[PDB]
Every structure is written in structure tokens, then in C-alpha cells.
């Protein structure tokens, strides 16, 4: 062990690592005896695959490159896929191929092995077609899911039904092949969920200008034998009354996960009154910001329990008893499950990290309570030394309210600062913003604690995870709260004598993005920052500037047009370019459809001249959010290097980022 300056300290751990590791097990599912979830490969085009783990253990990619199992449903991705198993062949399964949106469908165990072949019809309209949240219905020879089709050029020129297409692709090149279930007096809705006798159905609905985590309505109808629903009508829900989602047990009743008691709670609902009943009454989380359609924290097993990912702050994964009102949580080593879920026999599946380990797909068995691994097992690319040891702590700010963060000091094996000097820290910002970030085991941000630079993973005022009220302090405060916290924070670390005041950063993506922005424009707090696609050009942003589902999400972050037309100047980003004094990077991808790499042109225009330093990488072939592994390689080195210069440290294996004004 040896001293040196922080951030100069010599880490095993370098972006072609972190990249290589980025991502996690999702989408989640049991199809027979089997388990398949959709994995990241950033080393193939940043593709995603569907990983099939068999019940002898075997686990294996079952589609090769280029195929591409994600959708732009909501432009963050509805459910993927669905399987069957089937008496011979195989089971049968159907995925959405990003690369033409469309669906398809394989059987892995056919001879000749998996070959996709297409089940929907395109269109050169708008954003075309798109689907989600397929549910495989083998009896009917169809598949039925929820679906996107544009109907003009504009972002919102389009509509959404719950749909069903027939198996035999006779629909892949006839669009009135395609069944539409429902009608699209929703602008927004999920896929159905069939009850068990199948003569009813249920999905999510809402519209304009309220967001899903504001309140939703849960629609029905009756199941015709021809199969056309019929008695549409909505069983439940409102505009304030968020219901994040809605299964039906195996006995034929309907669970559904709602905040009208002020967190997620799961009740059990009257299929034709309406009438809901608690099922365990928690100051808990029992769901979360229903972002893309086919999420699920809570999920029936056929002997009558129910499988939960749930909890205040940190979701835990634990078999809750509707009878006794118990609730038995895993145990193992994860602090931290996804909302992702799935159950089969006495199992219930998730997954789930660790601050020690990477997300895995872990298995509960409610029979004996035992929690193991049986998918995606993690095994440490470098020595487990070089992980940071995170504080989940609480800062109280000046009028008393709690500020939840994680803080994650400088870290190594092999180094200690020097005696007089404190560590600079890095404040992350979250995207979203109604969402949260978990406290695991993420080489991002171990990329520099293990070089000798603190982290601080704020989970600002508005944050899931904390009950309807906290989320709600977010609704008009966009740019004021989330900015505030993340500097209440960082000055408090400063304070405290943990952090150096002087080399403090802020940084984050998408909403993450505009806080760090807003910070570097509102406030003198830090030394420079890392903004990634943000949110920078608000009246830009309302006038057709973001997809669909958020094209009036600023309504709740800043107040509606109408009532705050001010607002949408002021509060920009844009509109103070001029008062960013310290130096930043700028990371945007360019095929970015919720935010436009517009938004940094037009940013990097107003601060030209103004004789800061800074730097713009944009990337093509990037949506939102970096998938491809050369991507972030550049994006992480380009950060390291903005604070290696800042902080006035000399950062090795990565190469000196060009700071122009």
C-alpha cells in the first residue's frame, strides 16, 4: 500500500471493462420448465439478446447478431417477447426486432435451429409501426399485444390499441390482418392481461397531459368466444390514482398494485365492482414509475401466494401470504431486485445485485425460502477489493426534510490519499427524474472510486421508491429541487470534511442531465461537470421536441404551459448559457428520439465565446443512452480525462479530452 494523490491511483478496472460489464438481465420469464431474459451484448452492436436457461442448468444466447430483441414502444422499450411450451417441437416464441420494429417469431428447437420469421406488417408513415407486451395464445393461433401506429409526421400523430396477430403470419404483409382489440381512445396503453376461464381482460390506459405515475385507469371487457372484447369500461382508477399494475391469480381473482393509501399497495379487486381490498397495508413500495409497458413487481403463484419486490427505498423480493398478511423476504447476499418477475411451480424469479456483485437472475422457492442463483452468475473481473463500500445515508437539509444518497468513498487496496489532501467527489444525478437508483455494485461508478475519486449517488426530492407525497415534491420544482438536493448534499460531504471542497463535479444523463446543466447555470457549487442527452431547450421541448409519452411530462415538472408560460424560459438551461463559469463535457447520442441532439447545438452555440472550457462528443448509431461498447469506452474516458484536467490529476490510460472555448 502506497500514497498518492487522489485520482491518481492505479485501478485494474478500465472503461473497456465497465462497458464490457454494463447492463443487466431483463424481461425476465418462465416458459415451461425454462427461464429466458433479455441480456445486453455491447460488444455486438449493442444489440440485446434472449438468453435461454434450461432446467438442467444450460444457459445460452438463442438468437445470434443481428437480431435485436428491443422496441421503441414509448421509445424506452415495452416487454420484448413472450413464450409458450408446447407438447413436441419445442416451445414457441415471439420477440420485436429493433431493427425494423417488427415482431417475430421462432422456435429454437426446430430443425434447422432458431429462425425468425415475421408476423407484422410495416409502414413509411411517421414512426411506422410498433409493438409490446406480447401474450402467446396457441389455442387462437394468435398473439395479442398492445401497438404504436403512427398516423402522420409528428411526433404524436399517433395511436395505440391492444391488438392481436395471427401466428401463422399471414398478417406480415396485410395490416388488416391485424385484429384491433380494443379501440384507441387512449392515447397510451399496455398489453391484456387474459384471466383464467380467458373471458375477460384487463390493461393500463391513460392520456395526455398525466404521466402513468400520476394516475392511470384499469380497463376491461369481456372476452367473446370469437375473441373481440366487448363492455369496455374502466374498473378502476383515475387521474390521481396511479396503478402500476395488474395481474389476475390463478384462482380468478385481480391484483392490482395502487398508491391511493400513498404507496404501491397490493389489493385484491371485485372483477365486475370495482371494489378493492388491501392485501398488506405498508408504508412500502409495491410497484414503481410504470416507464414502459410489461413491468412487474409483484407476481401470483398457482398455490396462492404472491411473489413481491418491495420495500421503502431499497425493493426486496419476498413471498407475501394474501391470508396471513406475512411477508417472508429472500435472503442471500442481494439488496436490490428489479422489477422484473416471473414464477413457475413453487419458484418466483427475479433479479437482483449486490453492492458486491453484478444483477443475476436469482430464483425464491417458496416450499423451503431458499434464494440461489440460477442465471447470469456473477463472477468478479477484478479483485472485489477494488469495490467501493457504499454509505446509504441521509442528509438533512435546511428546512429538515430528509435527502436519501449513497455515498461511495474513495477506495483501493493498493492506495491511501495524501495525509493533507481530501478527495474530490463526483455528484450523479439520476435520470428520469421519477425514478431512483439502487445501491449495488455498478463499475461505473467503481471506475473512480477505485482511482481515488469519491462518488455521491443522490436520489433527490422526487424520487420513486419514497411514497406518492416525495414524489410528488418534484410536480412544478423540476431544475429547482432535484438541483438543490444534489448541492445540498455535496456541500454537506464538503462540510464534514470528507470531500474537498474545491473538486466537487456534478454530472448525469437525461433528467440527469438537465440537473447537472441547471447546476453548472444556477449555482457555483462545482468545478465543472458531465452532461449526457439532457433536457437543456424546454420551449423547444414542448413545441414537438420529445417523443410522445413525454411530450408534455414537463406539465408535471414545471407546470403546464397555460399556467407557466415563464417558467419555460427561466427555468432552461439554455436561456443562462452564459453562466456556466467552469469547464464541462458534453455526451449526446445522435439518433436520440426523447432528446434531440438539437438540444446541445443550440446549447453550444449560446456559450460560444464565452471563453469557458469545454468539449461535445456526439455519437451516431446512439439512441438514447449509449448500447454500443466503443460508445461508452469514449463517453467514460472523455469524463475521466474532463476531471482528471479539472482536478488537476494525471489520469493514465486514458487519453487528454480536447477543452475548447
Same mark, same amino acid.
Given at each position: 500500500?502506497?500514497?498518492?494523490?487522489?485520482? +491518481?491511483?492505479?485501478?485494474?478496472?478500465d472503461?473497456?471493462?465497465?462497458?464490457?460489464?454494463?447492463?443487466?438481465p +431483463?424481461?425476465?420469464?418462465?416458459? @415451461?420448465?425454462?427461464?429466458?431474459?433479455?441480456?445486453?451484448?455491447?460488444?455486438?452492436?449493442?444489440?440485446?439478446?434472449?438468453?435461454?436457461?434450461?432446467a438442467?442448468?444450460?444457459?445460452?444466447?438463442?438468437?445470434p +447478431?443481428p437480431?435485436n430483441?428491443?422496441?421503441?414502444?414509448?421509445?424506452?422499450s415495452?416487454?420484448?417477447?413472450?413464450?409458450?411450451?408446447?407438447?413436441?417441437?419445442?416451445?414457441?416464441?415471439?420477440?420485436?426486432?429493433? %431493427?425494423?420494429?417488427?415482431? !417475430?417469431?421462432?422456435?429454437?428447437?426446430?430443425?434447422?435451429?432458431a429462425?425468425?420469421?415475421?408476423?407484422?406488417?410495416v409502414?413509411?408513415?411517421?414512426g %411506422?409501426?410498433?409493438?409490446?407486451?406480447?401474450?402467446?395464445?396457441?389455442?387462437?393461433?394468435?398473439?395479442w399485444?398492445?401497438?404504436?401506429?403512427?398516423?402522420?409526421?409528428?411526433?404524436?400523430?399517433?395511436? #395505440?390499441?391492444?391488438?392481436?396477430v395471427?401466428?401463422?403470419?399471414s398478417?406480415?404483409?396485410?395490416r388488416?390482418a391485424?385484429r384491433?382489440?380494443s379501440?384507441?381512445?387512449?392515447?397510451?396503453?399496455?398489453? $391484456? #392481461?387474459?384471466?383464467?376461464?380467458?373471458?375477460?381482460?384487463?390493461?393500463?390506459?391513460?392520456?395526455?397531459?398525466?404521466?402513468?405515475?400520476e394516475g392511470?385507469?384499469?380497463?376491461?371487457?369481456?372476452?367473446?368466444?370469437?375473441?373481440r372484447? +366487448?363492455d369496455?369500461?374502466?374498473?378502476?382508477?383515475?387521474?390521481?390514482?396511479?396503478?402500476?399494475?395488474?395481474e389476475?391469480?390463478?384462482?380468478?381473482?385481480?391484483?392490482?398494485?395502487?398508491?391511493?393509501?400513498?404507496?404501491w399497495?397490493?389489493?385484491?379487486?371485485?372483477?365486475?365492482?370495482g371494489?378493492?381490498?388491501?392485501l398488506?397495508?405498508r408504508?412500502?413500495?409495491?410497484?414503481?414509475?410504470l416507464?414502459?409497458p410489461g413491468m #412487474?413487481?409483484?407476481?401470483?403463484?398457482?398455490?396462492?401466494?404472491?411473489?413481491?419486490?418491495?420495500?421503502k %427505498?431499497?425493493?426486496?423480493?419476498?413471498?407475501?401470504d394474501?391470508?396471513?398478511?406475512?411477508?417472508?423476504?429472500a435472503?442471500?447476499?442481494?439488496?436490490?431486485?428489479?422489477?422484473?418477475?416471473?414464477?413457475?411451480?413453487?419458484?418466483?424469479?427475479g433479479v437482483a445485485?449486490?453492492?458486491?456483485?453484478a444483477?443475476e437472475?436469482?430464483?425464491?422457492?417458496?416450499?423451503?425460502?431458499?434464494?440461489?442463483?440460477?442465471?447470469?452468475?456473477?463472477?468478479? $473481473?477484478?479483485?472485489?477489493?477494488?469495490?467501493?463500500?457504499?454509505?446509504?445515508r441521509?442528509?438533512?437539509? $435546511?428546512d429538515?426534510?430528509?435527502?436519501?444518497?449513497?455515498?461511495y468513498p474513495?477506495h483501493?487496496?493498493?492506495?491511501?490519499?495524501?495525509?493533507?489532501?481530501?478527495?474530490p467527489?463526483?455528484?450523479?444525478?439520476?435520470?428520469?427524474?421519477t425514478?431512483?437508483?439502487?445501491?449495488?455494485?455498478?463499475?461505473?461508478?467503481? !471506475?473512480?472510486?477505485?482511482?481515488?475519486?469519491g462518488?455521491?449517488d443522490?436520489?433527490?426530492?422526487?424520487?420513486?421508491?419514497?411514497?406518492?407525497?416525495?414524489?410528488?415534491?418534484?410536480?412544478?420544482?423540476?431544475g429547482?429541487v432535484?438541483?438543490?438536493?444534489?448541492?445540498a448534499?455535496?456541500?454537506?460531504?464538503?462540510?464534514? @470534511?470528507?470531500?474537498?471542497?474545491?473538486?466537487?463535479?456534478?454530472?448525469? @444523463?437525461?433528467?440527469?442531465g438537465?440537473?447537472?446543466?441547471?447546476?453548472?447555470?444556477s449555482?457555483?457549487? !462545482?468545478?465543472?461537470?458531465?452532461?449526457?442527452?439532457?433536457?437543456?431547450?424546454?420551449?423547444?421541448?414542448?413545441?414537438?421536441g420529445?417523443?410522445?409519452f413525454e411530450?408534455?411530462?414537463?406539465?408535471?415538472?414545471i407546470?403546464?404551459?397555460?399556467?407557466?408560460?415563464?417558467?419555460?424560459?427561466?427555468?432552461?438551461?439554455?436561456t443562462?448559457?452564459?453562466?456556466v463559469?467552469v469547464?464541462?463535457?458534453l455526451?449526446?447520442?445522435?439518433?436520440? $428520439?426523447?432528446?434531440?441532439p438539437?438540444?446541445?447545438d443550440?446549447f453550444?452555440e449560446?456559450?460560444?465565446?464565452?471563453?469557458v472550457?469545454?468539449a !461535445?462528443?456526439?455519437?451516431?448509431?446512439?439512441?438514447?443512452?449509449?448500447?454500443r461498447?466503443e460508445?461508452?469506452?469514449?463517453?467514460?474516458?472523455?469524463?475521466l480525462?474532463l476531471?482528471?484536467?479539472?482536478?488537476?490529476?494525471?489520469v493514465?490510460?486514458?487519453?487528454?479530452?480536447?477543452? %475548447?472555448?
Amino acid at each position: 500500500v502506497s500514497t498518492a494523490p487522489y485520482g +491518481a491511483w492505479q485501478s485494474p478496472i478500465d472503461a473497456a471493462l465497465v462497458a464490457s460489464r454494463s447492463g443487466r438481465p +431483463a424481461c425476465v420469464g418462465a416458459v @415451461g420448465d425454462e427461464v429466458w431474459w433479455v441480456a445486453p451484448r455491447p460488444a455486438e452492436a449493442g444489440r440485446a439478446t434472449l438468453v435461454r436457461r434450461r432446467a438442467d442448468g444450460a444457459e445460452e444466447s438463442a438468437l445470434p +447478431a443481428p437480431w435485436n430483441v428491443r422496441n421503441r414502444v414509448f421509445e424506452y422499450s415495452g416487454f420484448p417477447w413472450a413464450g409458450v411450451p408446447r407438447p413436441a417441437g419445442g416451445p414457441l416464441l415471439v420477440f420485436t426486432h429493433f %431493427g425494423d420494429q417488427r415482431l !417475430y417469431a421462432f422456435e429454437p428447437d426446430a430443425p434447422g435451429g432458431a429462425v425468425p420469421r415475421p408476423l407484422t406488417p410495416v409502414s413509411a408513415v411517421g414512426g %411506422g409501426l410498433r409493438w409490446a407486451d406480447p401474450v402467446l395464445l396457441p389455442e387462437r393461433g394468435e398473439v395479442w399485444c398492445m401497438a404504436e401506429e403512427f398516423t402522420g409526421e409528428g411526433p404524436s400523430d399517433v395511436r #395505440r390499441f391492444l391488438a392481436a396477430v395471427p401466428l401463422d403470419g399471414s398478417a406480415a404483409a396485410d395490416r388488416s390482418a391485424v385484429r384491433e382489440l380494443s379501440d384507441d381512445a387512449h392515447r397510451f396503453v399496455t398489453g $391484456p #392481461r387474459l384471466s383464467p376461464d380467458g373471458r375477460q381482460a384487463v390493461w393500463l390506459a391513460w392520456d395526455h397531459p398525466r404521466m402513468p405515475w400520476e394516475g392511470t385507469e384499469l380497463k376491461t371487457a369481456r372476452v367473446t368466444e370469437d375473441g373481440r372484447f +366487448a363492455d369496455t369500461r374502466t374498473l378502476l382508477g383515475g387521474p390521481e390514482e396511479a396503478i402500476a399494475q395488474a395481474e389476475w391469480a390463478p384462482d380468478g381473482s385481480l391484483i392490482v398494485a395502487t398508491d391511493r393509501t400513498g404507496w404501491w399497495n397490493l389489493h385484491r379487486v371485485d372483477p365486475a365492482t370495482g371494489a378493492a381490498t388491501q392485501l398488506c397495508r405498508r408504508e412500502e413500495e409495491f410497484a414503481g414509475p410504470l416507464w414502459t409497458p410489461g413491468m #412487474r413487481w409483484f407476481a401470483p403463484l398457482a398455490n396462492g401466494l404472491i411473489a413481491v419486490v418491495h420495500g421503502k %427505498g431499497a425493493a426486496v423480493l419476498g413471498i407475501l401470504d394474501p391470508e396471513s398478511g406475512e411477508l417472508v423476504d429472500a435472503a442471500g447476499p442481494w439488496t436490490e431486485w428489479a422489477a422484473t418477475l416471473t414464477v413457475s411451480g413453487t419458484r418466483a424469479v427475479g433479479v437482483a445485485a449486490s453492492p458486491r456483485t453484478a444483477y443475476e437472475v436469482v430464483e425464491l422457492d417458496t416450499v423451503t425460502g431458499r434464494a440461489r442463483t440460477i442465471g447470469a452468475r456473477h463472477t468478479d $473481473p477484478v479483485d472485489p477489493a477494488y469495490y467501493p463500500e457504499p454509505q446509504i445515508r441521509t442528509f438533512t437539509a $435546511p428546512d429538515g426534510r430528509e435527502i436519501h444518497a449513497h455515498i461511495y468513498p474513495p477506495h483501493s487496496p493498493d492506495f491511501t490519499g495524501p495525509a493533507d489532501e481530501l478527495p474530490p467527489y463526483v455528484v450523479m444525478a439520476h435520470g428520469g427524474p421519477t425514478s431512483r437508483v439502487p445501491a449495488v455494485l455498478d463499475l461505473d461508478v467503481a !471506475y473512480f472510486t477505485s482511482r481515488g475519486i469519491g462518488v455521491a449517488d443522490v436520489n433527490y426530492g422526487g424520487s420513486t421508491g419514497y411514497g406518492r407525497a416525495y414524489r410528488e415534491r418534484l410536480r412544478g420544482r423540476w431544475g429547482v429541487v432535484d438541483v438543490e438536493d444534489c448541492a445540498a448534499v455535496a456541500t454537506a460531504l464538503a462540510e464534514e @470534511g470528507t470531500a474537498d471542497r474545491a473538486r466537487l463535479a456534478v454530472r448525469g @444523463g437525461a433528467a440527469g442531465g438537465w440537473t447537472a446543466a441547471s447546476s453548472l447555470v444556477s449555482t457555483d457549487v !462545482y468545478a465543472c461537470g458531465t452532461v449526457l442527452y439532457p433536457v437543456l431547450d424546454l420551449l423547444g421541448w414542448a413545441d414537438g421536441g420529445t417523443h410522445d409519452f413525454e411530450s408534455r411530462y414537463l406539465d408535471f415538472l414545471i407546470g403546464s404551459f397555460e399556467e407557466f408560460p415563464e417558467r419555460y424560459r427561466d427555468r432552461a438551461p439554455l436561456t443562462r448559457a452564459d453562466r456556466v463559469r467552469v469547464p464541462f463535457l458534453l455526451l449526446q447520442g445522435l439518433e436520440d $428520439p426523447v432528446c434531440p441532439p438539437e438540444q446541445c447545438d443550440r446549447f453550444l452555440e449560446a456559450v460560444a465565446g464565452c471563453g469557458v472550457p469545454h468539449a !461535445y462528443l456526439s455519437f451516431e448509431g446512439e439512441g438514447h443512452g449509449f448500447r454500443r461498447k466503443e460508445t461508452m469506452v469514449r463517453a467514460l474516458e472523455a469524463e475521466l480525462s474532463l476531471y482528471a484536467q479539472v482536478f488537476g490529476v494525471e489520469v493514465a490510460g486514458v487519453p487528454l479530452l480536447k477543452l %475548447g472555448e
